[PDB]
Every structure is written in C-alpha cells, then in structure tokens.
C-alpha cells in the first residue's frame with residue numbers, strides 16, 4: 001500500500017546541503033537527496049546510493065532521523081519516506097542536469113521554496129529530534145491534514 005523512498009540531509013553544525021531538483025516529481029523545490037529504494041537493496045543502502053547519484057557525495061554511516069508517510073488525495077500509493085542525516089561526507093557537491101546543490105546557513109533555510117511539510121519537521125531535525133509524520137496533500141501545495149510526533153526510535 002506504500003512505496004519506499006529515502007531522503008538524506010547533510011547537516012553540519014552551521015550549514016545544511018540542499019538540492020534544487022530540475023525535472024520530474026518535486027522539480028523547482030529545494031530538498032534533500034533521495035529517491036526510490038530498489039529490489040534487494042536495504043533502505044539505508046538505497047539512501048547512500050541516491051546521495052551519490054544526485055549530489056556526487058559519498059557517505060558512510062547514515063543516522064535514521066525520521067519517517068514521513070505522504071498521501072496525495074486521488075493517488076492510491078502512499079509514499080513512505082525514510083529520512084536520514086549525516087555530518088560527514090566526501091566529495092564536492094556536483095551540479096548536473098537533474099540537480100543543483102547549494103549549502104545554506106541554518107537560519108536561511110529556504111522554506112518558501114521547499115515542500116510545505118518541511119516547515120513542520122525540518123526544525124525538529126535541526127534540533128536533533130527524531131520523528132514520525134503523516135501528511136495528506138491535495139496537489140503539491142496544500143496540506144489538508146497531518147500528524148507529526150517526536151519519537152525515540154525511528
């Protein structure tokens with residue numbers, strides 16, 4: 001009933017890396033790096049793979065920080081997004097035809113140009129909290145209803 005996705009935030013003490021997606025689903029918004037998990041791959045391995053594909057960066061250990069389920073009314077499949085963070089990467093962020101990376105100071109996170117749910121859970125990430133969330137959307141701009149709770153085990 002749900003499809004697995006990953007989302008990785010490279011979050012360091014004073015800055016966070018986001019990428020502006022150029023095409024496809026979510027294009028035109030700043031976000032972390034991620035995508036669909038493949039057959040025979042663990043969620044964390046898929047998170048690591050997608051970070052490389054989309055940003056050019058190599059991460060070793062990833063830390064689980066959240067799970068968010070998205071419902072888009074009128075679409076049957078829920079999107080089960082597993083969120084991870086890291087403070088330690090190798091490589092320089094790469095701009096490609098699919099993605100434009102940029103570092104942001106923590107006070108300048110571009111919420112108006114991000115998915116609207118990020119305004120709810122990104123501040124929990126910044127304060128090193130973990131969470132379970134569920135957001136029901138109509139279209140890509142309107143949150144009809146949501147739940148969001150902090151957890152000790154993701």
Ligand SMILES: Fc1cnccc1-c1ccnc2[nH]ccc12
Nearest residue numbers: 005026031070079081115117118
């Ligand atoms: F950007 C996506 C890509 N694939 C699946 C789900 C999302 C998504 C949907 C709604 N809000 C979001 N905030 C951060 C990611 C995200």
